[PDB]
Symmetry: C3
Subunit: 288 residues, 3 copies
């Protein structure tokens, strides 16, 4: 919404279209540390957000602020390396701008990834949580990427998220994790977005558990929202990089610097995983 | 607050006063689908929000963006057909602007209506929930219509909502529902405002149940707030248009398009109901 | 963040430094009614926020909108009489501006006080709650004072609050309350910030209890956040001025006007208490 007019997206879509010979079918928003997933492409054509018209230029990070097209295990992709977040200051209509451009690029499916804390005790750091549902905390308070006048050309005023994360892909992945033979079945849980760049206190960590969330992160949710609004089929994972201290015995920490996990073959694992799933995303062509 | 100066309201109040021979006593903010309640007026004098100075012009809707004075079952009214919401983009000081003008129009009571999802399982779609209390989610995070410097001319800095919805009118309605002989007693529950124009996921639906809310909507609460701040006696209903999917068995939906209910004689029912209650609102005159 | 550039703080710090011969070590943000704590100073040098460059001038209050340096029981202090709040309209980067200046003034410890409602039933109005943890409600939704590009010169992008309130000072106070011989041990609980200037409904009062909070206030939390971000050791109290009506039997009220408590020797008590603790804050010098 606000700031971008429907034609802003059109222009950015057309430009891109007339700049990559590529027509993506799957948009992949690499979450922290899983940006390397880009390396798996072929016919990769890189675009710095900055070069792409209207696209939110990366803030301080920038490093890895590029939009990579090309192919992933037999899918015309378009990866977004380094997503945008609320805490960096981007109004949510900028955070999610890419999703709307993607859809206009033909993209009909969006796989969103992220690194998030483990709320569910059973989660072992290193895990990979297939997102089955989200609790949009900043949205309860108004921070919904859909706020503002709705453009019927993208979607309905009150779209429903009840079914955000595609159920099939959920199966097609619970199974793929298995068909691959990965030991600990890919987990599943409710991802709770939480903004602010700081990390949860033990007290916040427990309202999150209480509210029902299994993993705590600071993004994805706005992207899932404007994607669903457009119709994009959506499924995503969540690399549990750490265990949120639910205990006052405390004296430990899940800090980002300790991303490590998101540097481990953990990242690589979720990478190949995501690259396998490509085969399981419905090819618009079908061929029957 | 912000954007409107105390005299902005004064001007809009005076203009209105010097444009309708009507002096309202009850302001009625018709919620989605109960706007038809307008049809029950007499001496109805319509004002398009747009014509009224300083008044927030309706966004995309507009259709039914009018302020209707006149009378309801022996009360000098002023209905607002089509309220303003956070999701349309209106800063809450615009959403609630009307309530402050109303008070300056002499209005001493505000009946607020809305269409909201059913969180309490016992609620059957179609019901009518007398609002006994609200959980202001977007306010916990700052989105309170009272934020900004307080104008003692409207009220106190830290007004209390503990007692938002007038207890009498609650009786005077639990009973009127009965005195009328309506079968299923008018329900009662906590209305939880939730912004964002999208609908609740099954995961959000459950934190709402957990937090204690019985119905989930995207408005009213800011209006109740600035009304109480002014002193307006306040009572309101909530047409449970659908049942929020608290279950993962899911495969159903409460979407707005399926408003239906809010088109049914349900709307009409809550209408006549609201028109009866007019007799039960304390006439400033009294006559002892 | 936003609005203030790193050098804005530098300038305000230098100005102050070159205007008070004082070099504070402890910043004390007096909460409502405990501003009198100022009276306990020596070599007190007052600065009206207004006179200090870049400093957020007080809104309507103003009265008691001053920054008082000087000494408290053997500590070079700098008290802030009358803090800034979200409900007054200050963007959180203004609310917390002082904390960042303080740190640049050399301040290495911040004792934050506030007046807050009692959620935990056991709390008797009048009590004093040593803050052991906070639940940042407006932050869950984005209202974190750290939002925006992070300045590594103040701190890390994702600082951790798991350990906001210094554990030592917590002991050093649970004990000091005792070493002093005060009867009812100083309480302890989770402080939940909640913005909006209005007060909790019985329904909101219960989600707060449910979420785990013991006291409910409308500030502190942003200050604790940017303090921790800078490294400031932090501990704070909370004068339970009233009992939040968790009961529908209701017919009572905790309203600010009924601050009283915060006027009582209660305020004075928490004052001398805070002045004793000065001796227990680690002198940067140490002397071994
Ligand atoms: N809210 C939250 N986010 C986390 C946590 N651990 C990792 N993250 C995510 O990983 C990055 C920081 O490590 C951010 O972009 C967060 O989304 C955690 O414990 N809590
Ligand atoms: N948050 C929420 N609002 C609803 C629901 N059902 C109806 N509404 C309300 O009705 C309109 C959309 O149907 C909006 O103005 C909402 O206030 C529901 O399940 N959840
Ligand atoms: N949210 C909340 N704040 C309170 C309450 N009682 C006192 N306060 C605080 O005291 C002032 C008003 O009395 C505000 O600055 C609040 O932080 C209460 O019951 N709820």
């Amino acid at each position: 919404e606000n700031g971008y007019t429907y034609e802003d997206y059109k222009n950015t879509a057309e430009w891109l279209l007339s700049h990559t010979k590529h027509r993506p079918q799957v948009a992949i928003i690499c979450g922290s540390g899983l940006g390397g997933l880009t390396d798996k492409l072929t016919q990769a054509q890189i675009f710095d957000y900055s070069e792409i018209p209207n696209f939110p230029r990366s803030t301080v990070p920038g490093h890895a602020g590029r939009l990579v097209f090309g192919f992933l295990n037999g899918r015309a992709c378009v990866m977004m390396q380094g997503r945008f977040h609320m805490y960096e200051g981007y109004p949510l209509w900028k955070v999610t701008f890419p999703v709307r451009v993607f859809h206009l690029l033909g993209v009909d499916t969006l796989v969103v990834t992220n690194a998030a804390g483990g709320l569910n005790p059973k989660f072992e750091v290193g895990d990979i949580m297939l997102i089955r549902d989200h609790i949009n905390l900043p949205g309860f308070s108004g921070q919904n990427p859909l706020r503002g006048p709705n453009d019927e050309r993208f979607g309905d005023r009150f779209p429903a998220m009840s079914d955000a994360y595609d159920r099939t892909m959920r199966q097609r992945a619970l199974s793929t994790w298995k068909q691959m033979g990965e030991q600990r079945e890919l987990q599943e849980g409710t991802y709770v977005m939480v903004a602010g760049p700081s990390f949860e206190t033990v007290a916040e960590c427990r309202v999150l558990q209480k509210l029902g969330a299994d993993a705590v992160g600071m993004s994805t949710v706005p992207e899932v929202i404007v994607a669903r609004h457009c119709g994009l089929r959506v499924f995503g994972f969540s690399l549990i990089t750490n265990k949120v201290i639910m205990d006052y015995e405390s004296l430990e920490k899940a800090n980002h610097e300790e991303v490590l996990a998101a540097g481990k073959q953990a990242a690589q694992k979720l990478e190949q995983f995501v690259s396998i799933l490509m085969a399981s995303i419905p090819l618009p062509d079908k061929a029957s």
